[PDB]
Structures are given as C-alpha cells and as structure tokens.
Write a protein that binds this ligand. Structure first.
Ligand SMILES: Nc1ncnc2c1ncn2[C@@H]1O[C@H](COP(=O)(O)OP(=O)(O)O)[C@@H](O)[C@H]1O
Ligand SMILES: [Mg+2]
Lengths: 392, 294
C-alpha cells in the first residue's frame, strides 16, 4: 500500500509542519508513521526508504527534543545510507543538533565537515536553501570553537547565496556588512572590508527604513577610524607631515600582485556576479582607498558624505545618542587634522571644539548622576584644548 | 553591588524520590556546592528563611540608602522553580518583598509625612523577548528614551499613586495576573519602579531635590548554546562574533537600567536556588555565574 503509505505520510508531513499547535498529536502522527513502517519489513531502495522513514521518525521525535529515541533511529539511518539523496546530510546535521544538546561539539563538527565534503565530491531548490543553513550551523559551532575566521568565510558564502537567490532585505545586509567589517577590523583585514559596506550601500537602493542609516554611517566611520589607524601605523606623533619614510610602495605593483593573489579569493568574495560586480566597480572607486597621505581634504570629504548621513542620525536621535555619535565624529575629523600635520591648518580643530561647545549644554541637561559620562565629555573638552596645546 | 542566595526547601518528589542534596548552607556568607565548593556571598538564606527575614535582612537595610538619595536595582536571579516570584510577590501568608517594601514605605511615608514635602508613585512592566509591556494598563510595546534631563524614560509607562496596604497587594496581584503564561512563563521578567520625590523640612517647598528610584526586577529563568535556525539569529551571532569579549556578568534591560547600573546605585542580585542533584548542572553554573557577578 506504498501509495497509500506516502499518501498518509504526506498528509502527516503537512501536519508535522503545523493552544500548542504541535507535539500534541504530532507525536501521534509519529506513531502512525511507525505503523506505516510496519508493512515494509527494489528491496535495496526499500532499505533507503526505511532509513528515510526512520529519519522521518527521528524528525518526528522532537517534542521540544524530548524524544531522544529519534537519535537512535537516525544513527541506524546513517548506517543504512552510508553505502551510498541529499537528505542524508540533513540527517547528519540533525545529529549534530542532538550532540549540541549533549554538548558533543566535535562530533557535530565532524558531521558538518563531511556534509560539505560529500556534496563537493558529488560536485533543485531544497539543497539550494539547506546548504546555506548548514553554513550557519557551522558558524554556531565555530562560535563555540572560536573559529572566527572559518565562520566568517561561511558568512560570506551565505551572503553570496542570499545574493544568488532572493534572500533580500537591506537592513539585514547592512548589519551583515557591519559586523563583517568589524570582523575585518578585528582581524585588521581592512582592505577586504572596504567593499563590504559599500556593497551594502549599493543594496540600499532597493523606522529603520531611514533610521538604519546612522548605523551604516557609524560603520563608514569605523572604516575611517581604522584607515586612520593604518595611517597611525606610522604614528603621527612619531613622524612629521611627511611619510613614506617607511617604504613608499603605497600602490607598489608588488603589493598589487600580492593583493591580486589574495584577490583571487577576494574577487570570489565580491559576490556581485558581474552585474553587481560592476556596481561593485563603482564601489571599487571607494575601495581604492588604502593608505592615503596628502588627502586630508579627501579624507574629510569621505567623512562629509557620510557625515551628512550622520547628521540625519543626529536628527533621528533625541539629543542623547546624538552626542554619542558626535563624540566619535569630532574626534574623527580631528584625527584627519592630526594627519594634516600643519600649523597653518587648525581651523577645523576649532570647529570640532565648537561642536563640543554645542555638546556642553547636554552636561547641564544630564541631571542623572552620570559622573563618568560627564567626565568623558569633560575629557572631550580636554581633547579640544589639547588641539590648542599642540598649536601652542 | 551585592550578591545573595535563597536556597529553597525540598519538595514532595525530592523527598519521595530521594535525590541527594547538593547544596549545603554553612553560614551567612558561606555555602558548599556538592566539588565541595565553598562559595562566598554577601548573605545566604536557607531552606526555611521567612519572607520577613528576606526583606528585613536585605531590602530594609537597602531602603536606608534609598531614602538618602540612592537609586536601587534589584535582580531576582534564578531558574524555574527558584521561588523568585514567591520571594517578590509571595503568598497571602508569606507575601514577598515587594509588598513588604511598600508597606515599609508607607511607614517611611509616615516617617516623613510631616518632615518632607514629598510624593510618591509607581510603575510596572513586563520584559519578554526584549519586548516591553506595561502591566499596570494593557498597552503595546513601550518606547524607552531619554527625557529632558537624560533620564531613561519608558515612554508610555504608567505611574500610579496608591495609599493603602490593600492596594499594595491588590495591585501587585493584578500586575502579575497580566504576565505572559508559559503558570508564569519562564522567559518573563518583571520590572517595577519606585518613585520617591522628597523635599527636606529645612528646604524650600520649591527646592530642587533629586528623586530616589528603586527598580525591582524578577528575572526570567537563567536555565554557549545551540542557536535557533534563522538568518536573524545568524546575524545576531555575527554581531556576537564581532563583539569583543567583555567577559562581564552583565539587552533592553540594560537600556532600562542604563542609568541604574551607574553611580549612586544600590545594586543587588539574589540567586534563589534548588538544593537537589536533579538541577546540579544549572546550580553549579549559577553559583559560578554569581562569582562572575562578584
Ligand atoms: N526560594 C523558595 N523559597 C520558598 N519556597 C520556594 C522557593 N522556591 C520554590 N518554593 C516554592 O515552590 C514553588 C516553586 O517556586 P516557583 O513559583 O516555581 O518559582 P517560579 O514560579 O518564579 O519559577 C513556589 O510556589 C515556591 O513558593
Ligand atoms: Mg514566577
């Protein structure tokens, strides 16, 4: 009655998807599947289907994962199918979940590793989705295993795949890029990060609808903060207004080739699939920024474009985080002027102080005993005064 | 910045299904886990401590600073079965510290009913999955923002002005009756706020004197974990990966407590806990969590 078995199964399947709405009766269906199993015990494919049934039983055996017997079913299924479709790695991954509950990270990891390897050894919609889900699960594991680098790789892969399909939502991409760039900041791979937010910036062409822009701007700022740190690799306090006292080679062909060798992979990361890689090319104009010297006007300009976006955040925030963000921005612009190591250019240093003066009023506003908050702002005034100490 | 423990009494099942007891209370500051871990606290209550003892030995002393102009933060840490709600709300015979606080505050009101040109009021909401809902009136999500003097104002949160002891409990009950059902859900947090406006006898009737505020929080069941299979979760994971290892004991709760985790605060956390070996794993982690707090 195989047709009637699958018939009932499929009905049960839909029901398995369905004041509890599940478990209560889902478990009954679980048992109905076992009844359907009964009749089964060519035959080689029957055995495959048996593993599928027991798999389904394992799938059914959840009840908030109370039903550990499913684990037992799944192990058997594995053995049945190891002689030789893609649902089998799903099962492996599910076993990984069970191990996560048992804290057995390593075996779960091993399953995931082989899930990937297998598909690759092999070489139209389910897999397309599942594959990426798997990458996420790995990232979870990696969090626990602190395999941040590996996780990040997978993150890109999922970003890719989300881009390959229609998994789109601008806010998500924004925060994806945000955290990614932070990863790169954490790993100092600024050069890759460059296209990341800016790619998301392109994505934004298609509430947080407007408010997310400050989060985005903050990240643009982060770029600059670290680009300034790149500049501070030749710490401005230790050098004069001149640079490349160190090797010059800011765009050395040598480095271009090095970067190209790395770009064998970074271009893979450029997930613009030609069309949006051309959009990325428009972005690459911004990506070209690496370690600038006499570009404090341009540097500031880079800020100013996103400064104005920042000013919208000053608007969005109700005079609170306005200043938290301004705080950063003032230092940011001032740091461009640290790089603009000239006694003839201190007007901006004054302007940043002027903004701090605008930020003075908030210290009379904050009647909460936010001593250190207040002090931090006092330190900001000290910093402005330090600008002048250096001028004098 | 204090950490205390309330070891609950064992139940029928624990006595029938003789589970080995793991938690051993030694003295005011010491208890032993199993491991034989001599954990040291600011105060430990045993299986039989009364509500009056809990209140009188904690909150009552704390209120001395509250009345002196300090803000307070109360964290009822524990898992499902900890006794957290009974400790705060309580039974009719053994009402919790919230009731007792208010009754004690009525006494405090009487203490300064002549002395000060004071006024009080209260507020109360639920935090569930980081969502904020007023439990004193049926409302939607509340907007936590800073006010005209940077105070963390939960815009939309009501403020009430009761007088009698009947109202204390009556309203506490009414508020807890509006909490999300799992029996109260293990993921629900309760957040109360006591507003103490007061003006000293020698000060002008229009003299600017700061308001003392006490936050009472029933924390959700505390019970590194597999993450939900969602892209949003992945994004959160990415954010976590991006984040630096703060390693602090440590949300919308921290937003709510932004200015209540700072200076002039009387922060206290209690770990209401189970003595049975059935809950050994969580208990260990709880006690080690408490060490993170300490
Ligand atoms: N810490 C405790 N002190 C006294 N009795 C307790 C304690 N914990 C548990 N019991 C009692 O057994 C029950 C379990 O407490 P419980 O209400 O389940 O904590 P919660 O409901 O907040 O998870 C309660 O009725 C409580 O009064
Ligand atoms: Mg409760």
């Amino acid at each position: 009655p195989w047709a009637e078995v699958c018939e009932k199964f499929q009905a049960a399947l839909a029901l398995s998807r369905v004041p509890y709405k599940s478990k209560y009766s889902a478990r009954a269906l679980l048992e109905e599947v076992k009844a359907l199993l009964g009749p089964a015990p060519p035959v080689a494919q029957r055995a495959v289907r048996l593993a599928v049934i027991e798999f389904h039983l394992g799938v059914n055996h959840i009840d908030t994962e109370e039903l550990s017997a499913g684990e037992e079913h799944l192990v058997k299924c594995l053995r049945l199918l190891r002689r030789y479709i893609s649902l089998c790695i799903q099962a492996q991954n599910n076993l990984g979940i069970l191990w996560s509950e048992r804290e057995e990270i390593e075996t779960a990891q091993a399953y995931l590793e082989s899930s990937e390897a297998l598909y690759n050894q092999y070489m139209s919609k389910r897999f397309e989705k599942v594959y990426t889900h798997n990458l996420y699960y790995l990232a979870q594991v990696y969090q626990h295993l602190e395999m941040f680098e590996k996780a990040a790789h997978y993150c890109h892969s999922t970003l890719k795949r989300q881009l390959e399909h229609n998994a789109y939502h601008p806010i998500e991409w924004a925060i994806n890029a945000a955290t990614l760039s932070q990863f790169y900041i954490n790993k100092l791979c600024f050069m890759e990060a460059r296209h990341c937010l800016s790619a998301a910036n392109v994505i934004f062409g298609q509430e947080l609808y407007h408010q997310r822009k400050g989060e985005i701007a903050r990240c643009w700022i982060k770029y600059c903060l670290t680009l300034m740190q790149n500049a501070q690799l030749s710490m401005q306090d230790n050098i004069g207004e001149l640079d490349l006292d160190k090797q010059s080679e800011l765009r050395a062909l040598r480095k271009k080739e090095l970067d190209e060798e790395e770009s064998i992979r970074k271009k893979a990361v450029q997930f613009g699939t030609g069309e949006l890689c051309d959009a990325i090319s428009a972005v690459e104009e911004k990506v070209s920024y690496l370690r600038p010297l006499d570009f404090e006007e341009a540097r500031e300009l880079f800020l100013l474009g996103q400064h104005y976006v920042f000013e919208a955040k000053e608007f969005f925030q109700i005079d609170g985080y306005v200043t938290d963000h301004i705080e950063v921005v003032q230092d940011h612009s001032a740091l461009f002027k640290v790089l603009a190591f000239f006694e003839t250019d201190m007007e901006r240093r004054c302007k940043m102080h002027k903004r701090r003066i605008a930020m003075l009023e908030p210290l009379t506003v904050d009647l909460n005993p936010q001593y250190y908050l207040l002090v931090n702002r006092q330190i900001q005034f000290e910093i402005a005064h330090a600008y002048y100490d250096m001028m004098d | 910045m204090k950490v205390v423990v309330r070891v609950r009494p064992e139940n029928t099942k624990e006595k029938a299904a003789g589970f080995h007891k793991v938690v051993h209370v030694v003295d005011k500051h010491i208890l032993v886990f199993d491991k034989d871990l001599k954990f040291v606290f600011d105060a430990v209550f045993d299986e039989t401590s009364t509500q009056s003892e809990v209140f009188e030995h904690t909150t009552k002393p704390i209120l001395r600073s509250f009345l002196n102009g300090y803000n307070c933060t109360v964290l009822a840490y524990g898992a499902t079965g900890a006794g957290k709600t009974h400790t705060m709300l309580g039974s009719a015979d053994e009402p919790g510290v919230m009731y007792l606080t208010m009754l004690h505050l009525y006494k405090c009101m009487d203490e300064i009913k002549e002395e000060k040109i004071c006024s009080t009021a209260v507020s109360y909401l639920e935090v569930y999955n980081e969502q904020i809902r007023d439990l004193l009136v049926n409302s939607g999500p509340l907007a936590v923002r800073e006010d005209t003097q940077k105070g963390v104002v939960v815009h939309g949160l009501t403020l009430h002005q009761p007088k009698s002891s009947e109202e204390i409990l009556h309203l506490l009950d009414n508020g807890n009756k509006n909490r999300t059902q799992h029996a109260t859900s293990s993921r629900s947090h309760a957040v109360f706020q006591i507003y103490l406006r007061q003006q000293d006898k020698t000060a002008s009737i229009n003299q600017n004197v700061r308001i003392a505020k006490m936050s009472l929080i029933d924390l959700a069941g505390s019970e590194r974990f597999v993450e939900g299979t969602n892209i949003n979760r992945s994004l959160l994971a990415l954010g976590n990966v991006i984040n630096a290892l703060a390693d602090s004991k440590r949300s919308k709760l921290t937003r709510l407590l932004k200015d209540s985790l700072g200076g002039n605060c009387q922060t206290i956390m209690i770990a209401a806990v189970s003595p049975s070996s059935v809950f050994y794993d969580d208990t260990y982690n709880t006690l080690k969590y408490a060490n993170r707090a300490k």
